[PDB]
């Protein structure tokens, strides 16, 4: 349930998946 | 909702694409 540790992974996954389209990361 | 949706349960690359620009 450590969202901060989870978020670190999420951002790396989005980097790979989104590639050149990029993304907005909002910790809502 | 990405934190809610993908931290408790595993998200596929298919689900993750919904969050791209
Ligand atoms: Zn980790």
UniProtKB/Swiss-Prot annotation, chain A:
This is Insulin B chain. The lineage of its organism: Eukaryota, Metazoa, Chordata, Craniata, Vertebrata. The gene is INS.
UniProtKB/Swiss-Prot annotation, chain B:
Disulfide bonds join 6-11. This is Insulin A chain. It comes from Sus scrofa. The gene is INS.
